[PDB]
Each structure stands twice: as C-alpha cells, then as structure tokens.
Amino acid sequence: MRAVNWNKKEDDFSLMFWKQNIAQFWTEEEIAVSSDKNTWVQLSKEEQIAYKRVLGGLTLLDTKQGGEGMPLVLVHLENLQAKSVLAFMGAMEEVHAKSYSHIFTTLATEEEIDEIFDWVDTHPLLEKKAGIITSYYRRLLKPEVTKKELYMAMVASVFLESYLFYSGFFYPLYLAGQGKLTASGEIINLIIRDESIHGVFVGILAQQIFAELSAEDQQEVQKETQELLMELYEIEMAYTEEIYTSIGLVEDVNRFVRYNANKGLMNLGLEPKFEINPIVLNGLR
Template sequence: MSETFYEAINWNAIEDAIDKSTWEKLTEQFWLDTRIPLSNDLDDWRTLSALEKQTVGRVFGGLTLLDTLQSENGVDAIRHDIRTPHEEAVLNNIQFMESVHAKSYSSIFSTLNTKTEIDEIFEWTNTNEYLQKKAKIINDIYLTGSPLERKVASVYLETFLFYSGFYTPLRYLGNNKLANVAEIIKLIIRDESVHGTYIGYKFQLGFNQLSEEEQGKMEDWMYNLLYELYENEEKYAELLYDELGWTEEVKVFLRYNANKALMNLGLNPLFPDTANDVNPIIMNGISTGTSNHDFFSQVGNGYLLGSVEAMKDDDYLIGMN
C-alpha cells in the first residue's frame, strides 16, 4: 500500500456538525454585487447634501479597507489553527466573500461618484489616522498573536468595527433613501453575522481547553483590546458624524455591537447598551432579511439566492454550552 501524502476531504465524515451547517448557510446566502441595480439610487443620491455625500464616500472607503484586510490577511491568519478539513473549506468561502464585499463598495463608488471623487475617497481612506490605527492593531495581532488572539481580532473586526460604517446606509434605508446601496450592506451584514458567530464558536472550543488561570489572562487581554479599539472608534465616529449630528447614536450602535462580539466569543457584555437603546430605524435595517430581486425585469431592490433565515440573537450563543 502506498504512503498517504495528502488526504481527500470527506464531507460524509463530519467531525463537527457546525462546519457542515455553516457551509450550507454560507452557500445558500451566496450573492454578487453585479445583480443589484445600484443605478436606481441615483435620484436619491442627487438629493443629498455635499457633506452627506462626502460622509457616505468616506464610510465606504473605510469599510473597503477593513474588508481588504480581512480578505488578504485575516482568514489566512486563522487558517493555521484549523481543527478539521471542513473548517478550512468554510474559511475558503469566508475569504472569497470578504473579497466580494470589498469589491461591492467599488461598485457603489463607480455608480455614485466621479473618478476624481473616488481618488479622493481612497486617498482619505489610506491616510486617515483612526482607520489606519485600527487596521494596524488588528493586523499586528494577525501577524504575531496566538491562534486564539487572532480569532478574537477577527470577531472584533467583523462584529464590531464594521458597524460605525454600516450605520450610515442603514439610516438612509430607514428614511427611504439609497435602498439598493443598503441592500448590499444588508447582504454583507448577513454574511458577517455568520462569520463572526462561526469564528467565535471556534474560539470557544480552544478557550475551553485553557486552564482557569490562562482563561483569566485571555479575558483580561480581550477586554483591554476592546477598550483600545472602542476608544479609537469613538474618535473615528466623531470625525465622520459630528457635523451631521449623528455621533451619539453611532456610539450607542457601536457599543451594542461590541457586546455582540463578546457574546460571539462566549463572554459577558461590557457595555450597558442593548437593542432597545439603538435607534429603531437602525435596528429595523439591521434585520438581515433582504428583498427579492427579479433579474430580468429589474423589479425589486435586492438579490436573494435561496431562502435564508437571518441570524437571531440566540445564534450568538452557539457553542457556549
């Protein structure tokens, strides 16, 4: 018998049922930005003030940066510590969809902005001190952190740091503007909710194998990191939203999602903010159901392949027991 150098993945021999269920959920949710009629939002776009247009551009520039980081470095950092071959397959899917997310923002730019405006957006993104600081904090952990620390950084990025940007399109959606732009964001949120839950679950498997002393040290590190990221995120939100008067609402939304990130990781919430404290318009928008879109008649404002249920609060508790 020949020596085995490489083993074929066998989806009929599942070691962790969560791998299979996550794969199925992610593949059912598959979507592409090219199927969403962004040009239908141009009439709404023209009604926005110059400040609002600038804010939207910068928000999406920041989101592009974070999705680029996640697709290029984040998933690879986690891949070194897989428990099953099926987990690697799920991570491959996650990595591809992060690239789809990053490209989707460019589709929005090409629809709404001129080339000069796009160049200005990326110049702002690539030189903004708060954006660059949070990217550096997360990427440094990806490069030098332990396997568990890398998972924490990934969950914080996907379940917390994205949401200072997500707030803007959700707010416009709640006011019946930019519906197709918001549809892309809702699709991205739907993906990120699964990514954060899954990677948080994998973190919990490793965390539960630590000694009590090691767990205490890890929890201290996690809370300290969250404080550092939140302090920076407050400044980022103030820069983006002070002139529009939205900053305090955004901070509530950030704290709510920071708690969600901690729940994904099996820890207790840090902030007192709950869903009841978030603007109900935003909470309505964050529900990850999407509108059906007819490819041929261009009727509707969304794109949904298959029938997919949104993640619920209870889904964040996956693996905690």
C-alpha cells in the same frame, strides 16, 4: 497527510455553516444601484462626504479580513471542515469589498473615487484600527503558533466582523431606513447577513480553543480580550466623532457601536460590557 473527509464530521457545526455560506452566495451584479442617484443628489455635501468615507473604511476592513484575517486563522486550524468554511468566508469578504466599488461607480466620478481611497490610505485612525487587528493576524506568520495566539487572532476577527464594521454600516442603514440610497442599502444588508454568520462561526471556533487552554492561559487571554475591546472602543469613539459630528449623529452611532460590541462579546461566549436606533432597524428590514 490528511485530506478533508466530509463523510465523517469533525464538529457539529461546520457542515451547517458551509451550507449557509453557499445558500447566501451573491455578487454585486445582482443589485443595480443606478436608481440611488435620485436620492444621492438630495443629500447635503456633508452627508455625501460621510457616506463615502464610511464606505471607504468598510472597504479597508473587508480588504484586511479577506486578505489576512481569514487566510491566517484558517492555515493554522487542524479542523479541515472548519478551514473549508473559513476559506469561503474569506472569498466572500472580497465580494463585499468589490461591491463597495460598484456603489462608488454610481455615486462618484473617477477622480472622486481615487480621492476616497487616498483618504483611506493616509488616515491615521483607520491605520491605527486596522493595525491593531492585523497585528493579531501577523503574529500567525510563523510555522508554529500557540493556542493563545490563535485564540487572540480569532477574537480580533470576531471584533472586526461583529463590532468594527458597525460604525460604518450605521450610515447606509440609517439612510435606507428613510428611503434614501435603498439599493446600496440592499447591498449593505447582504454584507451584514454574511458578517453576522462570520462572527458567530469564528466565535464558536474561538470558544473551542479557549476550552483547551490552561487556566493560566485562559486568564491571560481574558484580560487581553477585555483590553482589546476597550482599546478598539476608544478608537471607534474618535472615529465616530470625526465622521459624524458634521451631520449630528455621533451619539446615535456610538449607541450602535456599543450594541454591536455586546454582540461580538456574546459571539465569544462572554458577557456584555455596555448598557437599536429605530431608523437603522427600518433599514435592516
């Protein structure tokens, strides 16, 4: 039975990602958010509701990535150095999820917070979206998996990391780009910095597996990947309509979703399928 041996590289990238993950390490106690109250109270009721809802959705996605996506993809890897990186990335998803609770503590009463999480749990689009992704992860709950199954779990993971978060990240970035909720915006920026390298890394692992598949299997997963992309897109467009119609931002968020869907495809070595908002860009500064 093999032990991980870092003195003999298993690939040309795991060590750099290991070091970068650790270089980026942070926790919610580093960013105090109480000063956001002064701009929080300036938001309309509809704006506050949208913000809380998107952060609830982000919390759900990080919960599933740390508790299902990273663990189940990493248990089936043969590359022990890449497994190490994924384990750390999974822990960081739990840091991310806990940081949303830190934001909530400042922006909402205890009763308001539990209402957010009840809304998350009973929400049909969030259930459908998370169910589609986790179906690929739960396919790995068996002793022997195929490379097509592992590849598609990695595709699902890249799509979560590089694409499904972004209908939610839009709004904290959009507000922070205007000087509103900038401390929470700093947290979201730290989260994004992590998700960006998560998506690149899992996409490298996916491309390595893809190269080992037969031509027939390659065709099959290419079709599944394109179909998954567009299945998620239809759900995202329903989600942005539900969240953002009240505040007039639906088409802006949709443009942002498509930009990030293209980045997810590129992380997998695939061509873009869709043809950044300048305020969001200022929030990423």
